[PDB]
Design a binder for these strands. Structure first.
Ligand SMILES: NC[C@@H]1O[C@H](O[C@H]2[C@@H](O)[C@H](O[C@@H]3[C@@H](O)[C@H](N)C[C@H](N)[C@H]3O[C@H]3O[C@H](CO)[C@@H](O)[C@H](O)[C@H]3N)O[C@@H]2CO)[C@H](N)[C@@H](O)[C@@H]1O
Ligand SMILES: [Mg+2]
Ligand SMILES: [Mg+2]
Ligand SMILES: [Mg+2]
Ligand SMILES: [Mg+2]
Ligand SMILES: [Mg+2]
Ligand SMILES: [Mg+2]
Ligand SMILES: [Mg+2]
Ligand SMILES: [Mg+2]
Ligand SMILES: [Mg+2]
Ligand SMILES: [Mg+2]
Ligand SMILES: [Mg+2]
Ligand SMILES: [Mg+2]
Ligand SMILES: [Mg+2]
Ligand SMILES: [Mg+2]
Ligand SMILES: [Mg+2]
Ligand SMILES: [Mg+2]
Ligand SMILES: [Mg+2]
Ligand SMILES: [Mg+2]
Ligand SMILES: [Mg+2]
Ligand SMILES: [Mg+2]
Ligand SMILES: [Mg+2]
Ligand SMILES: [Mg+2]
Ligand SMILES: [Mg+2]
Ligand SMILES: [Mg+2]
Ligand SMILES: [Mg+2]
Ligand SMILES: [Mg+2]
Ligand SMILES: [Mg+2]
Ligand SMILES: [Mg+2]
Ligand SMILES: [Mg+2]
Ligand SMILES: [Mg+2]
Ligand SMILES: [Mg+2]
Ligand SMILES: [Mg+2]
Ligand SMILES: [Mg+2]
Ligand SMILES: [Mg+2]
Ligand SMILES: [Mg+2]
Ligand SMILES: [Mg+2]
Ligand SMILES: [Mg+2]
Ligand SMILES: [Mg+2]
Ligand SMILES: [Mg+2]
Ligand SMILES: [Mg+2]
Ligand SMILES: [Mg+2]
Ligand SMILES: [Mg+2]
Ligand SMILES: [Mg+2]
Ligand SMILES: [Mg+2]
Ligand SMILES: [Mg+2]
Ligand SMILES: [Mg+2]
Ligand SMILES: [Mg+2]
Ligand SMILES: [Mg+2]
Ligand SMILES: [Mg+2]
Ligand SMILES: [Mg+2]
Ligand SMILES: [Mg+2]
Ligand SMILES: [Mg+2]
Ligand SMILES: [Mg+2]
Ligand SMILES: [Mg+2]
Ligand SMILES: [Mg+2]
Ligand SMILES: [Mg+2]
Ligand SMILES: [Mg+2]
Ligand SMILES: [Mg+2]
Ligand SMILES: [Mg+2]
Ligand SMILES: [Mg+2]
Ligand SMILES: [Mg+2]
Ligand SMILES: [Mg+2]
Ligand SMILES: [Mg+2]
Ligand SMILES: [Mg+2]
Ligand SMILES: [Mg+2]
Ligand SMILES: [Mg+2]
Ligand SMILES: [Mg+2]
Ligand SMILES: [Mg+2]
Ligand SMILES: [Mg+2]
Ligand SMILES: [Mg+2]
Ligand SMILES: [Mg+2]
Ligand SMILES: [Mg+2]
Ligand SMILES: [Mg+2]
Ligand SMILES: [Mg+2]
Ligand SMILES: [Mg+2]
Ligand SMILES: [Mg+2]
Ligand SMILES: [Mg+2]
Ligand SMILES: [Mg+2]
Ligand SMILES: [Mg+2]
Ligand SMILES: [Mg+2]
Ligand SMILES: [Mg+2]
Ligand SMILES: [Mg+2]
Ligand SMILES: [Mg+2]
Ligand SMILES: [Mg+2]
Ligand SMILES: [Mg+2]
Ligand SMILES: [Mg+2]
Ligand SMILES: [Mg+2]
Ligand SMILES: [Mg+2]
Ligand SMILES: [Mg+2]
Ligand SMILES: [Mg+2]
Ligand SMILES: [Mg+2]
Ligand SMILES: [Mg+2]
Ligand SMILES: [Mg+2]
Ligand SMILES: [Mg+2]
Ligand SMILES: [Mg+2]
Ligand SMILES: [Mg+2]
Ligand SMILES: [Mg+2]
Ligand SMILES: [Mg+2]
Ligand SMILES: [Mg+2]
Ligand SMILES: [Mg+2]
Ligand SMILES: [Mg+2]
Ligand SMILES: [Mg+2]
Ligand SMILES: [Mg+2]
Ligand SMILES: [Mg+2]
Ligand SMILES: [Mg+2]
Ligand SMILES: [Mg+2]
Ligand SMILES: [Mg+2]
Ligand SMILES: [Mg+2]
Ligand SMILES: [Mg+2]
Ligand SMILES: [Mg+2]
Ligand SMILES: [Mg+2]
Ligand SMILES: [Mg+2]
Ligand SMILES: [Mg+2]
Ligand SMILES: [Mg+2]
Ligand SMILES: [Mg+2]
Ligand SMILES: [Mg+2]
Ligand SMILES: [Mg+2]
Ligand SMILES: [Mg+2]
Ligand SMILES: [Mg+2]
Ligand SMILES: [Mg+2]
Ligand SMILES: [Mg+2]
Ligand SMILES: [Mg+2]
Ligand SMILES: [Mg+2]
Lengths: 49, 272
RNA sequence: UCGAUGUCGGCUCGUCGCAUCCUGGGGCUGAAGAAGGUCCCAAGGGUUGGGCUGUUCGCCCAUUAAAGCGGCACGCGAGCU
RNA sequence: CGAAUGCCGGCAUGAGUAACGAUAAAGAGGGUGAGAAUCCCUCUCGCCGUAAGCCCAAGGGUUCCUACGCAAUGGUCGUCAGCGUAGGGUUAGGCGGGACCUAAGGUGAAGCCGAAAGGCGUAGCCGAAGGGCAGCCGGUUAAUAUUCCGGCCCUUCCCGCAGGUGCGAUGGGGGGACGCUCUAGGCUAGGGGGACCGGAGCCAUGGACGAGCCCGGCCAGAAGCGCAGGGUGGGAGGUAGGCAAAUCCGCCUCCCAACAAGCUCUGCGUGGUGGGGAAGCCCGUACGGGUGACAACCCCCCGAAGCCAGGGAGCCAAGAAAAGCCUCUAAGCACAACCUGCGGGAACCCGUACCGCAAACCGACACAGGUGGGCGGGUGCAAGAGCACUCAGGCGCGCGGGAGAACCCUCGCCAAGGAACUCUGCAAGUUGGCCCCGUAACUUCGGGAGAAGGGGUGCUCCCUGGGGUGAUGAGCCCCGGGGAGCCGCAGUGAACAGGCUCUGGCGACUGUUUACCAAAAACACAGCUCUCUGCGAACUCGUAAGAGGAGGUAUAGGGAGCGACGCUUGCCCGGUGCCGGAAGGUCAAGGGGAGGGGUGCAAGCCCCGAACCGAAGCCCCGGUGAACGGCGGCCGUAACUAUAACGGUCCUAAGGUAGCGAAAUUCCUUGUCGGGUAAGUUCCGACCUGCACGAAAAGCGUAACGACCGGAGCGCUGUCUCGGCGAGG
RNA sequence: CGAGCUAGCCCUGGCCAGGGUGAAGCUGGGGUGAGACCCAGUGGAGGCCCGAACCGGUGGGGGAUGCAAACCCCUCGGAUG
RNA sequence: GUGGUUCGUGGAGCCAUGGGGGAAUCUGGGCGGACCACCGCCUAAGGCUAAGUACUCCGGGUGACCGAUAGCGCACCAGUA
RNA sequence: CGCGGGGUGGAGCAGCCUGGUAGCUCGUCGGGCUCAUAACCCGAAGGUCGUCGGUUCAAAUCCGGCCCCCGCAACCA
RNA sequence: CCGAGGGUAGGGCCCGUGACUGGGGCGAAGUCGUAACAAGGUAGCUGUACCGGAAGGUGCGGCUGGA
RNA sequence: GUGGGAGAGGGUGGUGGAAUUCCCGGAGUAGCGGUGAAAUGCGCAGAUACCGGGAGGAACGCCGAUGGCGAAGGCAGCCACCUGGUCCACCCGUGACGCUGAGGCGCGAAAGCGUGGGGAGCAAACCGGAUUAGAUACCCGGGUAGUCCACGCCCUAAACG
């Protein structure tokens, strides 16, 4: 039947986006750590135009 | 009135509709004086505070005039009488001679063509509005104010009305659609007559949908749910509550009074 | 046997015991004959179809030579329901 | 280290076993090659065809095209590929999005709130398949095109001249601007017909050189006309409203209109001109090219859910906003400006390949699943997107070959009997579409009803009645009727298409629910009742501010139960709850200090502390059962027995009324009678000894409704006696 | 950290082939002092009916190291709310 | 009414405080564990102030530290696949 | 089988738990009123306290054993 | 073609019967009470409505066949 | 026809005073209610009795009669609007147009029912207190439907002269 991953570019940047994470105190920390851990990608790689 | 139906479908037998004869060939509302976008929504910021709402026909707000000392002395002619989805009372639209249009909740009687007005002057006739003092003790009246300049608030439901009782200082005793004798200030307007369309209390919704149309989702009894989400809940084949009847949140609901005790509004009240 | 021995009844398939329901042999009979009663030998073969109940079992209906009792994890779910 | 269902790696076993992913299906000849069932080609065969065919959107991100290639990837093979290496490929003022608008909602200056983080927040801004907006048809590439080229047609800005006018704002108004259902008129897309126009060709096998077969008879097109159709009154005075001002709008009062007459505004025909243009045949493709071609390019018919659109009628549940656009005036400015006609100039950013019901997306897979929108031809079956066959177009689903055992799956048929099967007719069968006869109890007059039960259905000829489009006619296309006759076992001859009834229980009903074992008698539901709530309402969320309630106001809103409707819902306020009681009793902090203590030489300083004054709450006094709940025991008595209308007595707060009753409640129980059966632990009707019914956790009934649950009969049958044969996987 | 699954609501678009049954309301007629009412014809109502799409998921069968960590075949519920 | 100190109401001071009451300027005020006398010690309700102390992203030295299942998760283009 | 409740004049109930004392309503008997019966009035009688044991000086009363009676439990499988 | 009749299917009326139940009639001397006739010891009768073992009681309006 | 008269004939709108019950204030004590007699009940939480204020519903004293009116059921403070019957006089008009009336149709006390409203007093059922052998009655204290209005049903009677 229908599954749980229904990709959607908008929803994805809108939710796990970078400006998205900067906006909140908890998300900014999410960035810190990922930066502090090394992670090549701080946030998901949404795309297209 | 109240239209009836032959049983050509169970439900549309007991079903009963209103009679919109009193509706002056109007229907399409009046831009300008209303309508405004009406933000429908069953909960506040986030959560749902009143339960069981949502869904139900889209609606446009008819921005009515609920404080008439706006036009003291300026007479206006009642133009139409139309339907208002936001209330039980039908409403009348009227053109002042000032050239301004505005709606008023329509009183029983008021016919299209009639002239109506407000102010200390104003003749005591259906439609006219005046400060409570200047109104004849005993006359009935609707659309009362509670405090000078704050707008109408009592007897505005379909065909409801309040009767003046006496005077007493800068105050005048009323008798609200509920039976409470209240002391209102003299300077509160109150347009004379009863609200009209009193057949409203007689409409037999009819089916399940009918309720759904007016935006009210099904209502489930506490008795149906479990202990986890309401007092009356569990365990075997139904049950008799098992304790003093209570609400989802738990306070008694078969008798417990609510008005907050030490309210300042107490002293101006006298009844039930 | 609880780091698991699936459990009532039915169904399919059986197989064994004798404390034998039938058929064969036999003694006593309050056994004239026919038909019985009871007991001894005998297990080779046989031991029906329905109505009711999840039923085991039973009670009925129509029969029959008879419509036997029990065991095999109250036989048989890596065979079925 | 030998164990920890230990951790990591490696390699065994089952095992050449199960599988190789829809039963839509393959065969052959010829190529290329080191090697072909599997790659290319041709012929035959099969499958889909409201798609298994085209066109968008989302998602994917090189998968597209071409040359060179098989290690691995492909469930086998592979010369092929969505794979490997390389190169090429996506072109926009007019399509989509942005230099436009607003929706929910986000954010947020002003302001409010919160220990901090942060929460709220009218202006504004962000925010979209909603509003706004100017490109249609052909041609080209190996791969892109409403983008490039051709034909034709438009939109903005900027700068000019020509000339009209008071111009002029983020401000005023108008407009934009709206639901559901059913619909008229005229059009188009789309499709059928043709003795007519245009064509390569074809006479097969017994007949046919014939109004013969087969193939095709269009597309776009500026203004104007023409045909539809939508919008819209025009004057003049008065003015106190539209938060400044208006000449605008609004509201009065007179005039001419009431018509679409006239202005505009769309649609659709015609239109200068531009383009396309079959079959067949010739070729070399992995495909396209050439010829047919000076191609013809016409006449009827059917006809939309689409177009004229802001069309019309009806109904209640009463159906976004803002900008563009029109108008109006304000500051300013009128050598500006703005409006209209002609020019030339300027016209940016992103997306464009390919997949796209799927092998390129979501499911770890080339996965029998999931995925929004538009087009979706013909014939027949009453209709249709249904069903069978089939255009275009695309497939034969990436292991094959043989064999013809048991058994399994899916399917077909069966003597005689037919439910005997079994927990249960589970399953499967019977039935089946349209037309016409014909239908009961009961009933809320609607229904029950497709009740039940029947007859008709094909083809041929004759006669004949209506329409529709054409002119009042031929044709073409729809609906009818009568009468003769023909062939089969059989005429909705294939495919799609109810078994029926009687009777109980439960729930009134259409609905809803345990995604992934429960769809119900459960939830909901109209309706009834109780109780709260006077509005800064009650209630809910929140520390708050704040919001929902509600821009509502007792005919309203929160809460509880019951659950259509009909007839009804008895008694108990003793305990519990809730409601009402400015009296009493107790009752905390606090007031009060009689009186006592500790130190000081002392004034003083510091402690305890009795009266008494002291709230809510409890106690107490009343009420309240559609509030929490409760609603008896033992004896005796009537002139046959029998039982008990009647009596005695004990206790209670009061001692279940009606109606129902072996029940969805009955333990003893297969109660005991009656009914259906040859037989009936179920079922139906009774009785009442109700273990352990009973009146809004409603009581008893109820027409209709049900993938609910029990009982019976009819029909029919592989369920069974009791199996047998055949088919494919 | 999550409502790209699922639940509800808010904003804005879309979809529901074709057939049935035939409510009111009108129109005429009848009826009466005026009515109620009764006829036909019209009309096209409905949590109305048959039935695709679509939304489900009733019963059985298959599947159960599956095609599938919910599937497939036959059957069946609703389908203008 | 609370917090801090060893101090959990304790005979509970001292030090901070949210609430109420509310002074004085050396003959003034706090403190020395209830409180009072004496004898003593400090001088509240403004602020600044190195060094001595903690740590190891980074550089260097040393190891009765590991030697590619050890040692950082990574000796190798790893916070990667 | 298990839990706890109960046997009192003719009937139905008290009486114990803090042992010495059996009380109430009805009924029965005698007498009255009435023509007579009932009602009403006046008086009177009746209880091995379920039984066998002992506990104490003394048992309806306290304690164990049986005889019936009533109510409650008989669950997980 | 019609057609006696036979078959199948569903109605209508009538008769007979049925566990059980409703009330009725009739039957010398069974039980419970006192409703009515005297002012019947609450004047009675009545239509309706509720309640009660039973006659019956009560509410509402009425009636002279009572005062 | 003309011209006049009486009347609780009917419907609608409004309105007035008495009295009852309740609320509020004043004032005031040891009992009020009730009956054959009592109790239940109410009352020192301030009753009964008295005064002042307010709310509300229902019925209209005296006039009042053995009276009037209507077809009957039935109809009563007062005011007005709409409206029916009827009698007298004048003998002017029509000119036999008449009577009764199966069915139909309409009205129809009280109780009752549906829907919504209202609710003082009263009052089935119902609960208490007395009475009696017993009282599911008669007496007393409480009290719900109903009694009231609007609309729609119901169609009865000692609807009796
Ligand atoms: N014929 C009387 C009708 O039935 C009833 O009357 C019946 C009963 O009331 C009556 O019963 C009476 C009883 O009232 C009276 N107090 C005692 C008497 N012994 C009884 O008598 C009855 O039984 C006996 C014996 O069996 C018979 O012989 C006698 O005929 C019979 N009436 O017996 C009557 C039947 O026979 C109605 N009360 C009466 O109004 C009605 O009209
Ligand atoms: Mg608007
Ligand atoms: Mg919130
Ligand atoms: Mg938020
Ligand atoms: Mg109602
Ligand atoms: Mg509910
Ligand atoms: Mg539950
Ligand atoms: Mg709880
Ligand atoms: Mg509960
Ligand atoms: Mg239960
Ligand atoms: Mg209980
Ligand atoms: Mg075990
Ligand atoms: Mg083991
Ligand atoms: Mg032997
Ligand atoms: Mg012998
Ligand atoms: Mg055996
Ligand atoms: Mg055993
Ligand atoms: Mg057994
Ligand atoms: Mg066994
Ligand atoms: Mg098994
Ligand atoms: Mg095994
Ligand atoms: Mg070891
Ligand atoms: Mg391993
Ligand atoms: Mg093997
Ligand atoms: Mg094998
Ligand atoms: Mg194999
Ligand atoms: Mg395959
Ligand atoms: Mg085909
Ligand atoms: Mg690639
Ligand atoms: Mg390719
Ligand atoms: Mg190649
Ligand atoms: Mg391979
Ligand atoms: Mg594979
Ligand atoms: Mg090769
Ligand atoms: Mg490649
Ligand atoms: Mg730019
Ligand atoms: Mg907004
Ligand atoms: Mg914010
Ligand atoms: Mg904006
Ligand atoms: Mg847009
Ligand atoms: Mg555009
Ligand atoms: Mg392409
Ligand atoms: Mg403007
Ligand atoms: Mg505007
Ligand atoms: Mg030939
Ligand atoms: Mg053209
Ligand atoms: Mg102005
Ligand atoms: Mg060509
Ligand atoms: Mg319109
Ligand atoms: Mg704007
Ligand atoms: Mg201007
Ligand atoms: Mg492109
Ligand atoms: Mg493309
Ligand atoms: Mg699609
Ligand atoms: Mg494949
Ligand atoms: Mg797939
Ligand atoms: Mg879909
Ligand atoms: Mg089509
Ligand atoms: Mg068809
Ligand atoms: Mg199909
Ligand atoms: Mg057969
Ligand atoms: Mg046969
Ligand atoms: Mg048969
Ligand atoms: Mg059987
Ligand atoms: Mg059997
Ligand atoms: Mg059955
Ligand atoms: Mg079946
Ligand atoms: Mg049934
Ligand atoms: Mg049923
Ligand atoms: Mg149901
Ligand atoms: Mg579901
Ligand atoms: Mg489930
Ligand atoms: Mg279902
Ligand atoms: Mg299910
Ligand atoms: Mg608010
Ligand atoms: Mg609001
Ligand atoms: Mg409520
Ligand atoms: Mg319920
Ligand atoms: Mg229920
Ligand atoms: Mg009750
Ligand atoms: Mg109580
Ligand atoms: Mg009680
Ligand atoms: Mg009480
Ligand atoms: Mg209280
Ligand atoms: Mg107190
Ligand atoms: Mg019984
Ligand atoms: Mg029998
Ligand atoms: Mg029987
Ligand atoms: Mg029971
Ligand atoms: Mg029950
Ligand atoms: Mg109840
Ligand atoms: Mg129920
Ligand atoms: Mg249903
Ligand atoms: Mg049977
Ligand atoms: Mg078989
Ligand atoms: Mg085979
Ligand atoms: Mg009609
Ligand atoms: Mg219809
Ligand atoms: Mg429907
Ligand atoms: Mg359907
Ligand atoms: Mg501390
Ligand atoms: Mg101090
Ligand atoms: Mg010190
Ligand atoms: Mg010091
Ligand atoms: Mg420092
Ligand atoms: Mg390592
Ligand atoms: Mg090594
Ligand atoms: Mg590692
Ligand atoms: Mg267990
Ligand atoms: Mg009979
Ligand atoms: Mg009888
Ligand atoms: Mg009497
Ligand atoms: Mg008497
Ligand atoms: Mg009497
Ligand atoms: Mg009576
Ligand atoms: Mg009584
Ligand atoms: Mg004369
Ligand atoms: Mg007559
Ligand atoms: Mg009447
Ligand atoms: Mg009445
Ligand atoms: Mg009274
Ligand atoms: Mg007596
Ligand atoms: Mg009384
Ligand atoms: Mg009379």
């Amino acid at each position: 039947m229908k599954r749980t991953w229904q990709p959607n570019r908008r929803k994805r940047a809108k939710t796990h986006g970078f400006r998205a994470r900067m906006r909140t105190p908890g998300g900014r920390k999410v960035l810190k750590r990922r930066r502090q851990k090394g992670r090549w990608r701080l946030t998901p790689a949404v795309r297209k135009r | 009135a109240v239209k009836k139906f032959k049983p050509y479908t169970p439900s549309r037998r007991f079903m009963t509709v209103a009679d919109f004869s009193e509706i002056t060939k109007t229907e399409p509302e009046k831009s300008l004086v209303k309508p405004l976008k009406k933000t429908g929504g069953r909960n506040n910021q986030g959560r749902i505070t009143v339960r069981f709402r949502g869904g139900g026909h889209k609606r446009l707000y008819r921005i009515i005039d609920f404080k008439r000392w706006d036009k003291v002395g300026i007479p206006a002619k009642v133009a139409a009488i139309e339907y208002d989805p936001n209330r039980s009372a039908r409403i009348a639209l009227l053109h002042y001679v000032d050239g301004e249009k505005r709606y008023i909740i329509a009183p029983d009687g008021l016919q299209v063509g009639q002239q109506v007005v407000a102010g200390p002057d104003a003749p005591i006739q259906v439609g006219n509005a005046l400060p409570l003092r200047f109104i004849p003790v005993g006359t009935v009246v609707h659309a009362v104010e509670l405090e000078p300049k704050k707008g109408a608030k009592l007897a505005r439901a379909a065909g409801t009305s309040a009767q003046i009782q006496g005077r007493e200082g800068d105050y005048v005793i009323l008798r609200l659609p509920s039976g409470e004798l209240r002391k209102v200030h003299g300077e509160c307007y109150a347009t004379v007559g009863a609200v009209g369309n009193a057949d409203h209390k007689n409409i037999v919704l009819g089916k399940a949908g009918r309720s759904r149309w007016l935006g009210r989702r099904p209502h489930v009894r506490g008795a149906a749910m479990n202990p986890v989400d309401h007092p009356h809940g569990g365990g075997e084949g139904r049950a008799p509550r098992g304790r003093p009847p209570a609400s989802p949140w738990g306070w008694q609901t078969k008798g417990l009074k609510t008005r907050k005790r030490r309210k300042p509004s107490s002293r101006f009240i006298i009844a039930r």
